[PDB]
Amino acid sequence: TEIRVHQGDLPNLDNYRIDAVAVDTETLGLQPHRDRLCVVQLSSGDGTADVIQIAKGQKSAPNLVRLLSDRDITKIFHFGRFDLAILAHTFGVMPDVVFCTKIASKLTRTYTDRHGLKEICGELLNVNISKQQQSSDWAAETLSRAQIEYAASDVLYLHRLKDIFEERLKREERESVAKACFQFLPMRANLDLLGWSEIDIFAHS
Amino acid sequence: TEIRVHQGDLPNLDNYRIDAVAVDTETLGLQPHRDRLCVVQLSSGDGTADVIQIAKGQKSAPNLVRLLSDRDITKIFHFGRFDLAILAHTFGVMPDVVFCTKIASKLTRTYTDRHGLKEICGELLNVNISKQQQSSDWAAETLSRAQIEYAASDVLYLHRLKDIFEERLKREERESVAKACFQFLPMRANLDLLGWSEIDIFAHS
Amino acid sequence: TEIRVHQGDLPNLDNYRIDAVAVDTETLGLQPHRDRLCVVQLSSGDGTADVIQIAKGQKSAPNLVRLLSDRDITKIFHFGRFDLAILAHTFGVMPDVVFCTKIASKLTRTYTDRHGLKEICGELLNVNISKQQQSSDWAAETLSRAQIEYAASDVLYLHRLKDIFEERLKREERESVAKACFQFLPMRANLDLLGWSEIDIFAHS
Amino acid sequence: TEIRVHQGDLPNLDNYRIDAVAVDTETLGLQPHRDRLCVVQLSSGDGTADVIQIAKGQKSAPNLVRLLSDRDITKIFHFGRFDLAILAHTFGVMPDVVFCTKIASKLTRTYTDRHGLKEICGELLNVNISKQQQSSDWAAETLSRAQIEYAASDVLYLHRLKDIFEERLKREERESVAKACFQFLPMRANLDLLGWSEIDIFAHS
Amino acid sequence: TEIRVHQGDLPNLDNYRIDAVAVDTETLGLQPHRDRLCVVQLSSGDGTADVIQIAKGQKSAPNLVRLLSDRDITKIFHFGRFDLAILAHTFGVMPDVVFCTKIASKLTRTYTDRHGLKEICGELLNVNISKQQQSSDWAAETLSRAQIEYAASDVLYLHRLKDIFEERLKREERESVAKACFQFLPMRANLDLLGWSEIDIFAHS
Amino acid sequence: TEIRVHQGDLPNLDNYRIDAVAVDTETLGLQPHRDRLCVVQLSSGDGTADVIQIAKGQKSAPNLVRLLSDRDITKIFHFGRFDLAILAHTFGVMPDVVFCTKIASKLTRTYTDRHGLKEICGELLNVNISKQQQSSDWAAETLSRAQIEYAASDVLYLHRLKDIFEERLKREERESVAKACFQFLPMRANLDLLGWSEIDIFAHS
Amino acid sequence: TEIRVHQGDLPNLDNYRIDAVAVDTETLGLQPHRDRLCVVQLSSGDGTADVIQIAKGQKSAPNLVRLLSDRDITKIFHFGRFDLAILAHTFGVMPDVVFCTKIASKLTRTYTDRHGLKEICGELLNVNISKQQQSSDWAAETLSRAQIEYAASDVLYLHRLKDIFEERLKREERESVAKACFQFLPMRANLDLLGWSEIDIFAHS
Amino acid sequence: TEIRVHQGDLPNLDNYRIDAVAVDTETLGLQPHRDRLCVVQLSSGDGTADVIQIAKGQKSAPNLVRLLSDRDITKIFHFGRFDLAILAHTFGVMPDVVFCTKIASKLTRTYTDRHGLKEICGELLNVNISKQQQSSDWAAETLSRAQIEYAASDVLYLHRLKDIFEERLKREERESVAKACFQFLPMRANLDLLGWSEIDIFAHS
């Protein structure tokens, strides 16, 4: 649908006077200390998305960061463990009110071992997400139309998933488990930034 | 060392008007749904210990449970993930103010991969704990003297370790990380009881 | 295909005055202590099937359990190790006269290592079994038509397989081996319920 | 200890008018079709043992086979899965009333993963069995004194172990599980002889 | 594409007055002691094949066995290690003049790791072998036409492959290497029959 | 395209008075001591290629070796570790001014784990390389048209890739890292020839 | 032995007007971004050593760094890949004239797979290195005598090993191999610092 | 005992007019193309041995190679697969009358998985071989006395082992199996030299 592309930051928050915002990122790789943040995508759940290109060496994005810091607004991620880490490493603010659809999937879709976003969207919404058959240079000065549409597709459905997962968590009486997991998730991301990314800190060995 | 052996429960809490209590358990195995709790050992950090034999089918232990429920008293474990699970499964109360020396070791003793209690005690206190060369039936009606001495030896040093680990956590500026881990540890134990004991809930796969 | 869908139980056993009944289950997952029984499917071997949706917390299903307890009726399963476990956990009655097509396949189809129901039906009957709905929300209040047809397809062919496998077991002179395996299968399922689900009880290690 | 050595068979059954006999074997290796049975040792549970040297190509041992066939005498083995296989392969008779200390250990000593005979004897009886520091040619025409004493040491304690394991099976309410396992054990051995020795017939894969 | 189907044995050797014969087998599985020989296939190198059904318990096939033991006729196999084993086990005669296309492939097609018959036929002859969609009951009294054609397809091309592989062995100067491997192959099969099927007899460990 | 096929050597260097030449090889396999060099392909980057057939036992190729030795011409490879080894082993000259697109990919395409030439050409240039549908000999006296066109396709695009990778290396400020890696790559190939091909010489173990 | 312990830096370079200096480090762990440098050890090759305690957050050590940047002085390490990384990370200077005894061992001691310092010293010098029986806190304000003597023992023998290894490299004609490996080693360490510490940059996969 | 040390070759064969000679080698490592032959040991089976130091680059040893070529003299090895390879690589002559105690052990000592020379000598002869406490430089100009004695100990007992293994091979009726294995063993070594050292040429994959 409508995808608004920005350089550096949102112009304002007129579209984000809401109770929950869907958030995703794109980077040059899986290691936040080496691989810089290149794109941030946002959606209010109204079927539109904002795509913000982040410049190399950029240290601040005040409007976006105010949104990320607002404790009255839940940030919805799929596998937020990574996005939280890269966002905190880049802008210096660790979000602390979050919902993760992957943790929710692992707590509710107990009849499968496939917890990726594509499988969740397919099963829960009968929506077919098409995943790029190649990767791309997210640090490119000009993003392609295909890149923009792929980047937007990762945030367009997270509100609907959160609603369904919240009903299922209520149904199976696991709400407090999920709440505690989401409360701990930002510290799991911090542990990743500090150097324990390969360690399950709670395991016996 | 003075070891007081009790049947079922502590007679009173006269010996436990303190800020922190060391706690450990002994079971018939690693699976709380199959392997029953057999012994609970406690120490005030003094030179004496209390060893409480738990009967088959015992569902209540009012004095012990008061300690486990008292939010004003920190419960010290080594690998509390297991002990919390078996205690909650046995008595129906999940402690929520805990300190775990194994998590603290993983957060401070970054120069080694051996985090067992014997090795920790050896490095931090130059105390040699001798571990039994065989296992035994902890459900026996009468415990042997060797069993009682081993059970007491498992709690006598956790206070000194906690003091040292708190010094190290302050030194390396990891106090808030440890605090968040300890806050989440009871829910990790509940996740174990509910059926996710073999799953790292935060891993990508 | 005629599929009769019921809530809670069969109305009567008028359609099941027979020597063998095909049985299958659906659940929320592979772990009976966490994942509740959601659907039970039955077939008389005719062109119709019964699909009984089981409610959350349901403890009783007298007509179904009566059928399961009738020692004059052989219960046919594919991989009955699981179905027997979940049935016994849910209703408290362990069937003791059973036939399992997966054990029979391993005892007769020695020229292949693929013993799943789809492959067996393909080889033995030239019948094409489809999929995709296997991983779906079986706890939904209203099952979809696709879910109902997929659930029924799992019982429609077990009688024909039992007939062919009995012929093959006779041909290779392995009938008494199979009979002994079927006699032990309920105890293998009980061992699973008691906590040895990950243990080969007969292995050296 | 008194060890009576015989060639071929017992002279008579005067010492074996008893309710249970301990049985063990020695062979040229683990594969009954290649590696012949070389020695059979028996004990009445007293302080003496019988060691019977079996000749190459020997097809019959009437007194021994009388014991193996007698349904009024329980045959005690440690890991009878192997001994039953080699005995049935050699003499054509499969015992069908058996007790196995390894299954009993796996059903009762749930607090350890070490189920060897040495560990069981050490824990349950505080008896130290010394195992040969070298292997040897059990097919030798004349066994050494060290060989004979080692071979006998494998049967002198099985009665005492069976008595203790019977107490634990009663205490933990697993008597019927053990009984069903013992009934299936001869068929597990037959499955081994027929060619499924590397296959857990009850596993999903 | 003449395929002559026989019961028990060839009627005579009029079509096999030749210097080399292509040979293949079908069985109930990979373990000769458990899985009986069901079919023997022969080819003169022409466009026709002979498919011989072997009965359960059959001990003799004088014309076939005469062919197998005639040292002036080279027997061509693909992976003859197996066929030689099952033939020797069934009829009591081990061929000693053989050619194996798998050894030849491993000695000449060093630029690939895929040495199956389909890949060899595709690369060297541009012949497309179509493999069944599953395995089948080769012990059936009447083989289907599709089964017969597949069985014939396995021998129709071995002469042409032998000719090409001989050219390749001459080109890379490995004729004596291949000859020594072929000389040892019957004894490798004997080791398999005797019980070393899982052992590389030449490996250090 | 125009592909010039030669026997033994280039006729002259009239087409190669240039700053960089794309180089690839084909062999009988991955082991230079066993598997001889069969074809060398070259391109100046003008959309044409030279395909040079190397004879068995050929020790010299004077015009080609002049190109390989000339320090003013950068030799571009994909996974030059192999090509450098086989070229030096065959003609006795190790190139020392090289660029490798695989090392460059590992230093720049950090967002993917697929670094093969097909994936790089597909992703970076939107060019579809169609690879062999089987293997080939390459030792054939006369190469097929399909072989020649496939062989040429491996050098036609390396100049464009080198240009892009050099731009990306500049963007992420990794030029000196790549330069040091390329300086060491010939010595890595030499280490392979001397016998350390299976050893990461820099690993702790 | 004489061991001089310093705080922060060497007092002067009066003892290091030499051609080669032995260098080793101790840290809080294997990950330079998390685990700080705690101790630096130096030796002139005589019977004395210098042990320099490095403070938390220390950015400068001018005399030490003069040694590190003196192109006329070879720095001898055992497994310098790590020490170079941690030194460059801490003080911002990468030594570029180095010798590593582990690379030399892998290039000369080809008859063994054990390349640790204890085994090398044992074989080459008949010197017994005693390894600490526990791990310790190298960040302690005051190191114990056992710690100081252990830390010194790691540098006292590197000169003698370098002499012997140089003889071995000349004898086996691998001098140029070693020189190229040593020249690349600082860049391998830089690659570790940049984020490729887990990647063999030269491997095919 | 008496150990005669020579450089290059035996002075004559006066002590080796015998029907079987024990042979062993020492090298700089496991890869014959990289790691040169350093020592050859010989024994007549009496209480003395000859130890011959081989110089770097030495291409001929006429008396030794005369011994190796003599078809009337059986060469006894332990794991001759390696020694045959290195001998053929060094002197160009492949022995073709051999006996290997390791193959014999694998064909007779079926009751164990431990086939090393030390274990064999311990079991079969009650002879204690003491193995070096480290590795050493076998290319040293002067071998130490301890080195010479260790090297000699590997040949002093092979005759007695051959006699015992031949008795056992007769007893289990595996003489023709062993004979065929020994005939192929030189060709297994040739395959190693040609480049198939890591390939079981007879395996399915």
mmCIF file with all atom_site columns, N, CA and C in Angstrom, chain D residues 27-30 34-35 56 134-140, chain H residues 106 108-112 122-123 168 170-174:
data_model
loop_
_atom_site.group_PDB
_atom_site.id
_atom_site.type_symbol
_atom_site.label_atom_id
_atom_site.label_alt_id
_atom_site.label_comp_id
_atom_site.label_asym_id
_atom_site.label_entity_id
_atom_site.label_seq_id
_atom_site.pdbx_PDB_ins_code
_atom_site.Cartn_x
_atom_site.Cartn_y
_atom_site.Cartn_z
_atom_site.occupancy
_atom_site.B_iso_or_equiv
_atom_site.pdbx_formal_charge
_atom_site.auth_seq_id
_atom_site.auth_comp_id
_atom_site.auth_asym_id
_atom_site.auth_atom_id
_atom_site.pdbx_PDB_model_num
ATOM 1  N N  . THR D 1 27  ? 31.533 -65.206 25.726 1.00 0.00 ? 27  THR D N  1
ATOM 2  C CA . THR D 1 27  ? 31.532 -65.561 24.319 1.00 0.00 ? 27  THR D CA 1
ATOM 3  C C  . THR D 1 27  ? 32.809 -65.040 23.684 1.00 0.00 ? 27  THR D C  1
ATOM 4  N N  . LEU D 1 28  ? 32.967 -65.308 22.389 1.00 0.00 ? 28  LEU D N  1
ATOM 5  C CA . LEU D 1 28  ? 34.042 -64.698 21.623 1.00 0.00 ? 28  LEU D CA 1
ATOM 6  C C  . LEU D 1 28  ? 33.711 -63.308 21.095 1.00 0.00 ? 28  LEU D C  1
ATOM 7  N N  . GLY D 1 29  ? 32.553 -62.747 21.417 1.00 0.00 ? 29  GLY D N  1
ATOM 8  C CA . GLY D 1 29  ? 32.234 -61.404 20.984 1.00 0.00 ? 29  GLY D CA 1
ATOM 9  C C  . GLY D 1 29  ? 30.742 -61.141 21.041 1.00 0.00 ? 29  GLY D C  1
ATOM 10 N N  . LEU D 1 30  ? 30.363 -59.967 20.529 1.00 0.00 ? 30  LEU D N  1
ATOM 11 C CA . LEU D 1 30  ? 29.003 -59.455 20.666 1.00 0.00 ? 30  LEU D CA 1
ATOM 12 C C  . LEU D 1 30  ? 28.034 -59.897 19.574 1.00 0.00 ? 30  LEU D C  1
ATOM 13 N N  . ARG D 1 34  ? 28.413 -64.803 14.500 1.00 0.00 ? 34  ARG D N  1
ATOM 14 C CA . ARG D 1 34  ? 29.831 -65.006 14.243 1.00 0.00 ? 34  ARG D CA 1
ATOM 15 C C  . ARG D 1 34  ? 30.582 -65.544 15.453 1.00 0.00 ? 34  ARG D C  1
ATOM 16 N N  . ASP D 1 35  ? 30.234 -65.089 16.657 1.00 0.00 ? 35  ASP D N  1
ATOM 17 C CA . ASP D 1 35  ? 31.068 -65.247 17.846 1.00 0.00 ? 35  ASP D CA 1
ATOM 18 C C  . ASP D 1 35  ? 30.432 -66.260 18.793 1.00 0.00 ? 35  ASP D C  1
ATOM 19 N N  . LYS D 1 56  ? 33.484 -76.227 21.053 1.00 0.00 ? 56  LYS D N  1
ATOM 20 C CA . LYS D 1 56  ? 33.151 -75.819 19.693 1.00 0.00 ? 56  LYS D CA 1
ATOM 21 C C  . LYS D 1 56  ? 32.212 -76.807 19.021 1.00 0.00 ? 56  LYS D C  1
ATOM 22 N N  . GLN D 1 134 ? 42.838 -56.768 31.122 1.00 0.00 ? 134 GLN D N  1
ATOM 23 C CA . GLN D 1 134 ? 43.072 -57.224 29.767 1.00 0.00 ? 134 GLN D CA 1
ATOM 24 C C  . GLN D 1 134 ? 41.887 -58.096 29.387 1.00 0.00 ? 134 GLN D C  1
ATOM 25 N N  . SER D 1 135 ? 41.681 -58.267 28.091 1.00 0.00 ? 135 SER D N  1
ATOM 26 C CA . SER D 1 135 ? 40.670 -59.208 27.647 1.00 0.00 ? 135 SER D CA 1
ATOM 27 C C  . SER D 1 135 ? 41.355 -60.535 27.377 1.00 0.00 ? 135 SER D C  1
ATOM 28 N N  . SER D 1 136 ? 40.572 -61.590 27.189 1.00 0.00 ? 136 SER D N  1
ATOM 29 C CA . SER D 1 136 ? 41.232 -62.845 26.884 1.00 0.00 ? 136 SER D CA 1
ATOM 30 C C  . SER D 1 136 ? 40.378 -63.739 26.003 1.00 0.00 ? 136 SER D C  1
ATOM 31 N N  . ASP D 1 137 ? 41.029 -64.803 25.553 1.00 0.00 ? 137 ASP D N  1
ATOM 32 C CA . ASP D 1 137 ? 40.517 -65.847 24.675 1.00 0.00 ? 137 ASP D CA 1
ATOM 33 C C  . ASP D 1 137 ? 39.694 -66.826 25.496 1.00 0.00 ? 137 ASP D C  1
ATOM 34 N N  . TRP D 1 138 ? 38.393 -66.568 25.600 1.00 0.00 ? 138 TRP D N  1
ATOM 35 C CA . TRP D 1 138 ? 37.537 -67.443 26.389 1.00 0.00 ? 138 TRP D CA 1
ATOM 36 C C  . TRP D 1 138 ? 37.333 -68.789 25.720 1.00 0.00 ? 138 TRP D C  1
ATOM 37 N N  . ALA D 1 139 ? 37.782 -68.951 24.480 1.00 0.00 ? 139 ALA D N  1
ATOM 38 C CA . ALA D 1 139 ? 37.667 -70.214 23.772 1.00 0.00 ? 139 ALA D CA 1
ATOM 39 C C  . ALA D 1 139 ? 38.864 -71.112 24.034 1.00 0.00 ? 139 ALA D C  1
ATOM 40 N N  . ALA D 1 140 ? 39.798 -70.658 24.867 1.00 0.00 ? 140 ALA D N  1
ATOM 41 C CA . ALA D 1 140 ? 40.986 -71.427 25.203 1.00 0.00 ? 140 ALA D CA 1
ATOM 42 C C  . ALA D 1 140 ? 40.586 -72.765 25.803 1.00 0.00 ? 140 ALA D C  1
ATOM 43 N N  . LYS H 1 106 ? 42.205 -57.987 13.902 1.00 0.00 ? 106 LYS H N  1
ATOM 44 C CA . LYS H 1 106 ? 40.812 -57.701 13.589 1.00 0.00 ? 106 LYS H CA 1
ATOM 45 C C  . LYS H 1 106 ? 40.071 -58.947 13.132 1.00 0.00 ? 106 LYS H C  1
ATOM 46 N N  . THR H 1 108 ? 40.756 -62.008 14.432 1.00 0.00 ? 108 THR H N  1
ATOM 47 C CA . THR H 1 108 ? 40.793 -63.071 15.434 1.00 0.00 ? 108 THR H CA 1
ATOM 48 C C  . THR H 1 108 ? 40.392 -62.565 16.808 1.00 0.00 ? 108 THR H C  1
ATOM 49 N N  . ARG H 1 109 ? 40.840 -61.378 17.198 1.00 0.00 ? 109 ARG H N  1
ATOM 50 C CA . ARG H 1 109 ? 40.507 -60.829 18.510 1.00 0.00 ? 109 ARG H CA 1
ATOM 51 C C  . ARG H 1 109 ? 39.175 -60.085 18.410 1.00 0.00 ? 109 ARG H C  1
ATOM 52 N N  . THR H 1 110 ? 38.124 -60.853 18.129 1.00 0.00 ? 110 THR H N  1
ATOM 53 C CA . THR H 1 110 ? 36.790 -60.312 17.898 1.00 0.00 ? 110 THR H CA 1
ATOM 54 C C  . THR H 1 110 ? 36.091 -59.868 19.171 1.00 0.00 ? 110 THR H C  1
ATOM 55 N N  . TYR H 1 111 ? 36.659 -60.164 20.330 1.00 0.00 ? 111 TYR H N  1
ATOM 56 C CA . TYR H 1 111 ? 36.075 -59.822 21.614 1.00 0.00 ? 111 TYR H CA 1
ATOM 57 C C  . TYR H 1 111 ? 36.549 -58.478 22.131 1.00 0.00 ? 111 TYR H C  1
ATOM 58 N N  . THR H 1 112 ? 37.278 -57.718 21.322 1.00 0.00 ? 112 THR H N  1
ATOM 59 C CA . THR H 1 112 ? 37.748 -56.410 21.739 1.00 0.00 ? 112 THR H CA 1
ATOM 60 C C  . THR H 1 112 ? 37.790 -55.476 20.543 1.00 0.00 ? 112 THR H C  1
ATOM 61 N N  . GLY H 1 122 ? 50.469 -57.228 25.273 1.00 0.00 ? 122 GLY H N  1
ATOM 62 C CA . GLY H 1 122 ? 50.077 -57.485 26.648 1.00 0.00 ? 122 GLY H CA 1
ATOM 63 C C  . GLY H 1 122 ? 49.211 -58.720 26.779 1.00 0.00 ? 122 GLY H C  1
ATOM 64 N N  . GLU H 1 123 ? 48.228 -58.860 25.893 1.00 0.00 ? 123 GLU H N  1
ATOM 65 C CA . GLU H 1 123 ? 47.289 -59.968 26.011 1.00 0.00 ? 123 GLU H CA 1
ATOM 66 C C  . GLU H 1 123 ? 47.936 -61.281 25.597 1.00 0.00 ? 123 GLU H C  1
ATOM 67 N N  . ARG H 1 168 ? 45.624 -69.119 15.785 1.00 0.00 ? 168 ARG H N  1
ATOM 68 C CA . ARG H 1 168 ? 44.222 -68.726 15.958 1.00 0.00 ? 168 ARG H CA 1
ATOM 69 C C  . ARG H 1 168 ? 43.483 -68.698 14.624 1.00 0.00 ? 168 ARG H C  1
ATOM 70 N N  . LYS H 1 170 ? 44.031 -70.607 12.182 1.00 0.00 ? 170 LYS H N  1
ATOM 71 C CA . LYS H 1 170 ? 43.702 -71.990 11.871 1.00 0.00 ? 170 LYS H CA 1
ATOM 72 C C  . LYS H 1 170 ? 42.504 -72.421 12.710 1.00 0.00 ? 170 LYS H C  1
ATOM 73 N N  . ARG H 1 171 ? 42.491 -72.050 13.995 1.00 0.00 ? 171 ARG H N  1
ATOM 74 C CA . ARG H 1 171 ? 41.409 -72.470 14.887 1.00 0.00 ? 171 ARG H CA 1
ATOM 75 C C  . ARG H 1 171 ? 40.024 -71.966 14.460 1.00 0.00 ? 171 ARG H C  1
ATOM 76 N N  . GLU H 1 172 ? 39.883 -70.696 14.061 1.00 0.00 ? 172 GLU H N  1
ATOM 77 C CA . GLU H 1 172 ? 38.559 -70.207 13.657 1.00 0.00 ? 172 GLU H CA 1
ATOM 78 C C  . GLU H 1 172 ? 38.301 -70.341 12.162 1.00 0.00 ? 172 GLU H C  1
ATOM 79 N N  . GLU H 1 173 ? 39.211 -70.977 11.435 1.00 0.00 ? 173 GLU H N  1
ATOM 80 C CA . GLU H 1 173 ? 39.035 -71.310 10.023 1.00 0.00 ? 173 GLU H CA 1
ATOM 81 C C  . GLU H 1 173 ? 38.899 -70.068 9.141  1.00 0.00 ? 173 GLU H C  1
ATOM 82 N N  . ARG H 1 174 ? 39.795 -69.103 9.356  1.00 0.00 ? 174 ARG H N  1
ATOM 83 C CA . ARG H 1 174 ? 39.814 -67.840 8.624  1.00 0.00 ? 174 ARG H CA 1
ATOM 84 C C  . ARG H 1 174 ? 41.128 -67.645 7.877  1.00 0.00 ? 174 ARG H C  1
#
